[PDB]
Amino acid sequence: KETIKINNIMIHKYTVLYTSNCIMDIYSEEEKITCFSNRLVFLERGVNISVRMQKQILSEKPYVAFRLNGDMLRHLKDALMIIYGMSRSMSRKIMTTEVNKTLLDELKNINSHDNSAFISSLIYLISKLENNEKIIESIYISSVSFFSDKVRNLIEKDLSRKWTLGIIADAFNASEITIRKRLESENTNFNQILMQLRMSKAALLLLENSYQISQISNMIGISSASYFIRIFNKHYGVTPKQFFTYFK
Amino acid sequence: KETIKINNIMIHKYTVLYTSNCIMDIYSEEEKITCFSNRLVFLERGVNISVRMQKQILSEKPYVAFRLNGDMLRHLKDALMIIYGRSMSRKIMTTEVNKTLLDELKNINSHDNSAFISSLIYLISKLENNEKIIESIYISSVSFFSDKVRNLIEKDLSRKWTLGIIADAFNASEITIRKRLESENTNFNQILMQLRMSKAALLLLENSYQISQISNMIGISSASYFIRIFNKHYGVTPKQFFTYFK
Ligand SMILES: CCCCCCCCCC(=O)O
Ligand SMILES: CCCCCCCCCC(=O)O
């Protein structure tokens, strides 16, 4: 089957996706968005979504994706609040567009080496999109640091340690209630943050195609490679082997 | 004869010039740059240059020019020093505009200022040896005392200005102001003459004001006197200037 359903995908970096040969339904919050043959998808950081996906060509990769790390996105926010001025709807969180001739050829000669060239390519592209406010919005919203973000970074400093709400609540000078309700006010909780951190790191590493599963288990902090396969399958709704075979 | 010599052109706004159909020799300071057919020219604000320029097709305009006012240049400076972190070769720069970047310049509609700053930033991103430009955009984006003097003069171009009026406006003595302007390699009569003569050139290109109106507007009694001053300064008469650029 050239179709795959992947669950609980949480986007940890602002992501721009280009459906190189796939078609995709994005569910997330009891909603749904379709992304057709040749479109661009701008995914706000922090969303949690599920995906149903159709390959066009079976022998090829599903899509092509660009992810903006924390710095780059801070910069894009600043430059955007200089170029346009300074100032809850899943349709204001995930946006598809029709990639034009000039915007496409621009996407061609994008070499993600000169980071400034990338920020500029991205700004010019943003300038050449209609109804573009809703994208500007999602880039500033997802460009602020939340408390779940402080927790996320403290966990990433050593992904494999055995974390508890007790260690985070010691790190931050407050009690476990403080942390469970601040994280609850962000529509998440700590066991889920840890789970999302390990499962994304595992997916990406599995796509690198140069690590045994047991190593990836160890890298994210999971004893058994078979135990890791169970957790991955339960979370994403596919086994690492099928995920890998669909994405290679 | 479709070649023209224009002297003492003083750039009050960061200028990007595209020799749409002309060839041009630029004399900054005892130095010289030639700009071939289809090139871009980045002119640092505050430079004073002289130009000898030859049209390709005569029934058309010489070039196409973009001038960035203070707001826009401040926004460009800020945005540029977020995205990236005395030499007439760092003040006037010509480059080769590629095919694709040329089409980019085409679909430039200077209405959405955000779209224009974006087009400008993408262009700057697509230039080799472009460091020399970012510097000149920051170099020319700070406020000098000649600038404070310029803004006071521009608030009412037609008054009869002297050093005495400026030295009362700013709390200092005429020596203070002549020497603060001196360390900027200018003087007040030059500042005033350059405002009036630039404003006169631009207005003459607008094709909608009698010469007497332009004279009256810049602060010059006579229209025949203004024509004399213009010819003496620019090296052409307003009529020859207009007929060359229309
Ligand atoms: C779009 C379907 C692919 C599965 C998602 C892989 C990891 C999500 C990316 C991220 O963590 O930033
Ligand atoms: C190279 C073309 C120059 C001819 C006209 C110059 C008048 C503009 C003066 C200015 O921008 O401050």
Numbering used by the authors:
A (entry chain B): 9 to 95, 103 to 263
B (entry chain A): 9 to 93, 103 to 263
Mind quoting what the paper says about this structure?
While ETEC colonization factors are diverse, nearly half are regulated by the transcription factor Rns (also known as CfaD or CfaR), a member of the AraC family. Rns activates pili loci expression by binding to a site immediately adjacent to the -35 hexamer, which may be accompanied by one or more additional sites further upstream. Rns shows the typical characteristics of two-domain AraC family proteins. The DNA binding domain (DBD) (residues 162–265) consists of seven alpha helices linked to the N-terminal domain by a 3 residue linker.
Given decanoic acid both stabilized and affected Rns function, we crystalized it in the presence of excess decanoic acid, ensuring saturation, to assess what effects this might have on its structure. Despite the diffraction data showing significant pseudo-translation, the structure was solved to 3.0 Å using molecular replacement with the apo SeMet-Rns structure as a search model. Analysis of the resulting electron density showed both monomers contained electron density consistent with a ligand, which we again modeled as decanoic acid. In the unlabeled structure both monomers in the ASU were in the closed conformation. Therefore, we examined differences between the open monomer observed in the SeMet structure and a closed monomer of the unlabeled structure. The two conformations were aligned using the long helix in the DBD. This highlighted that helices making up the dimer interface and β-strands 2, 4, and 6 in the open conformation are shifted away from the long helix in the DBD by ~ 1.7 Å in comparison to the closed conformation. In both the open and closed conformations, His20 and Arg75 interact with the carboxyl group of the decanoic acid. In the open structure, Arg75 is between the fatty acid and the rest of the N-terminal domain, whereas in the closed structure, Arg75 is more alongside the ligand. In the closed conformation the fatty acid carboxyl group is turned 90° allowing both oxygens to make contacts with either His20 or Arg75.
